[PDB]
Each structure stands twice: as C-alpha cells, then as structure tokens.
C-alpha cells in the first residue's frame, strides 16, 4: 500500500453560498484596472467583475442562467484560500485582465463565439481555484497525494481544472446546463486547454511556439484552433502580467514574495532543501528585474507583435524596470 501524508490542498467545497452585493465597480476594459483597490471598497471584486463581464459579453438570455452564474462565482470564491497572492483577488484580476486583453484585439473579439467567451471567462475565474500557496515542485517534494493523482507537468493546473468542473456540475451552479452535449464538450475542452496553459513550465515553449506563429503571419481568427491558442496566450499574459498595469499596481502584487517566503520557511521547518531565491530578497527591486527581463517583458513584446493594439503593457513594464533599476542603484 502507498503510504502518503494528508494533502495540503483542500477538497472542493460544493456548498451553495449566497452571492455578494454587486454594484458598478470606469471602464472594465481598461488595463489600468486596480483590482486590489476595488477589493478594498466592494464586498467582492471577483463577483462584481464576473457579473459585469457576463453582461458586457451578453452571456445569458434567461434570468435562470444569470442566477446560476452568480451562485457559481460565489462558490468559486468560496474555494480560493486566503493566500497573499493566489487568492480570489488574483482570480478577479486575471478574469478582468483576460476581458481587457480580448476586448482590445478586434480580430479575435469579432470572431469569438459566445461559447468561447463563456469558456474564457470561466477558465480565468477558476484558473487557480483551491491553490494552496505552494508550487508544483513543493507538492512533489512533500509527496502530496495531489502530485500522485495528477501526474506529469502542471499538477495544480490539472487540479484547478478538475475542481472547476466539479463545481460547474452542481445543479445550482450549472449555467451551461442548457448547452447540448456537443457544445458542452467544446466548452470543457477550451477550459481545460486554457487552465492547462497557465502552467509556468510551458512558458518558454509557448513563447517560441507563438513567436513562430507570428513569423508565419499571426493568428487566423476564422480558425477555431487559432482562436483557442490566442485565448490561451492572452489568459497566460493576464495571469503573469499584473506588473504591467502600472507602477502603483505592480507594487501591490509583490505579495507573491510573501508566499515564496512562506514556502521557504515551510521547507525549512520540514527539513527540506530551501528553494533558491524564495527567502525574502534583500532588494525586492533588484530581484524583480530578472523576472521582468526573462518572463514578463518578452511576453508582452510578443503580445504586442501578434496584437498591435495591445501596446500599453510593454510601455508600463519598461517604466517599471527603469524605476526598479534606478532605485536598486
Ligand atoms: Mg496557477
Ligand atoms: Zn494564476
């Protein structure tokens, strides 16, 4: 028999929870949207954003579908842990960011089907659900049951995907119940693909992959396959791009360093080797430059080339880098 310790990841909470009061949280399409700030003034930025996106993209024809969406998002929020970074605020940020990036690219926006838009919003909303605030490597290091259940790369990503569908399966949350089987399968496949590609281990491969697509002329949005890849890239960019929304906003998202430090200490307490660079850096600013240069900047450079209308992120990142470099020295 396999002797495994209890998982550090919590099981899915299927309970029906009352959605929070949503009010007009101001353009939802703006990249300068400060999710943390909105969260400080409204009961739930995640629920307010999800409602607005659903309306902005005319998701529902019936009130019944609208109500299931509301309860689903409330339940999804109930399944995000109180982590410094991988929490419901990050979820709202990625959802709003995906909405913003997609809305800014005319070719893609004009060719996306209603089903594809619903899948994109649902995926962004649930992309980190149940995240324990520890990495896939950490789960593997402690021999967590989740690492044995979901094999191969993207352990947590597979878990988020499975959790999302488990919740969507609850009758009171199933807003896709009216879709026929072929449509629901398409929905599921898009969602799986999108959440699956948020796995940081695929970054370099995706950048080279899309770089080649760019050289070949970019995406052909009349092609379903290209729209899916485009959505995947934009979701990924939204996931790792809060630092590109402006200097003030970027600073707020440095809370990711708290989770890394927490993990470094968790590793130390467990007697495991400490992950390089996870302990709080002496110079937050200096430590960020490599991240911007290796991950974020190249990503938004690629995005701008593939979608010329998405330019702001790149300029904000360069402004941020100069500030970090100037303060570091
Ligand atoms: Mg994730
Ligand atoms: Zn994320």
What are the boundaries of each domain within the chain?
26-329
- Where in the sequence numbering do the catalytic residues fall? 86
Cα separation of the two ends of the chain: 57
Count of other CB atoms within 10 angstroms of residue 50: 30
- DSSP-H helix ranges across 179-296: 181-196, 203-215, 224-240, 247-252, 256-270, 284-291
How many residues are given for the chain?
329
Q: How far apart are CA 121 and CA 77, in angstroms?
A: 14
Coil/strand/helix, residue 292: helix
Check residue 11 and report its DSSP letter. Answer: P
Residue 301 CA, chain-centre distance (Å), reads 19
Q: Are 219 and 213 in contact (CB under 8 A)?
A: yes
Q: Which residues are annotated as a binding site for Mg(2+)?
A: 128, 157
CB atoms within 10 A of CB 290: 10
Q: Are 198 and 157 in contact (CB under 8 A)?
A: yes
Ligand 2 centre distance from Cα of residue 117 (Å): 19
How far is the C-alpha of 167 from the C-alpha of 201, rounded, in Å? 26
Question: Ligand 2 centre from 12 Cα, in Å?
Answer: 18
User: How far is it, in rounded angstroms, from Cα 216 to Cα 141?
Assistant: 41
Q: How far apart, in whole angstroms, are the C-alpha atoms of residue 93 and residue 33?
A: 8
Cα–Cα distance between 110 and 83 in angstroms, integer? 36
Decide: helix, strand or coil at residue 173. coil
For residue 93, which ligand has an atom nearest its CA?
Answer: 2
Q: How far is the CA of 324 from the centre of ligand 2 (A)?
A: 23
Residue 325 CB-half CA count within 13 A: 11
CA distance 116 to 297: 27
* Method by which this entry was solved: X-ray
CB atoms within 10 A of CB 86: 23
Instruction: Pick the ligand that lies closest to the CA of residue 155.
Output: 1
Tell me how far CA of residue 261 lies from CA of 265, 267, 278, in angstroms. 6, 10, 5
Residue 155 CA to ligand 1 center (angstroms) comes to 10
Answer yes or no: are the C-beta atoms of 275 and 257 closer than 8 Å. no
Instruction: Indicate the fold that domain 26-329 takes in CATH.
Output: Catalytic domain of cyclic nucleotide phosphodiesterase 4b2b (1.10.1300)
- 57/121 Cα distance (integer angstroms): 10
Helix axes 224-240, 297-306, angle to 10 degrees: 150
Rounded Cα distance, 59 and 127, in Å: 19
């Amino acid at each position: 028999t396999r002797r495994l310790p209890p998982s550090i990841v919590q099981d899915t909470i299927l309970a029906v929870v009352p959605p929070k009061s949503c009010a007009a949280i101001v353009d939802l399409r703006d990249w300068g949207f400060d999710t943390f700030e909105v969260a400080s003034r409204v009961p739930s930025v995640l629920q307010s954003v999800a409602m607005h996106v659903a309306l902005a993209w005319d998701f529902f024809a019936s009130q019944e579908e609208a109500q299931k969406w509301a309860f689903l998002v409330a339940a999804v929020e109930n399944n995000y842990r109180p982590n410094p970074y991988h929490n419901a605020i990050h979820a709202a940020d990625v959802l709003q960011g995906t909405f913003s990036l997609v809305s800014a690219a005319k070719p893609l926006m004009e060719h996306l089907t209603p089903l594809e838009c619903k899948a994109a919003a649902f995926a962004a909303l649930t992309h980190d659900v149940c995240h324990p605030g520890r990495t896939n490597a950490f789960l593997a290091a402690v021999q967590d049951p989740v690492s044995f259940k979901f094999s191969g790369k993207g352990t947590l990503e597979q878990l988020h995907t499975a959790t999302a569908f488990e919740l969507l399966n609850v009758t009171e949350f199933d807003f896709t119940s009216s879709m026929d089987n072929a449509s629901f399968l398409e929905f599921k496949n898009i969602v799986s693909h999108l959440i699956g590609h948020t796995d940081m281990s695929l970054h370099s491969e995706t950048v080279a992959k899309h770089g080649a697509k760019l050289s070949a002329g970019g995406f052909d949005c009349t092609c379903k396959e290209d729209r899916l890849e485009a959505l995947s890239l934009l979701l990924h960019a939204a996931d790792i791009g809060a630092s590109s929304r402006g200097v003030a906003i970027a600073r707020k998202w440095l809370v990711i360093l708290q989770e890394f430090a927490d993990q470094a200490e968790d590793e130390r307490r467990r007697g495991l080797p400490v992950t390089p660079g996870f302990e709080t850096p002496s110079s937050v600013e200096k430590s960020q430059i490599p991240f911007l240069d290796f991950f974020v900047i190249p990503t938004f450079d690629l995005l701008h080339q593939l979608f010329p209308s998405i330019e702001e992120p790149l300029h904000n990142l360069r402004k941020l880098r100069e500030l970090y470099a100037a303060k570091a020295g």
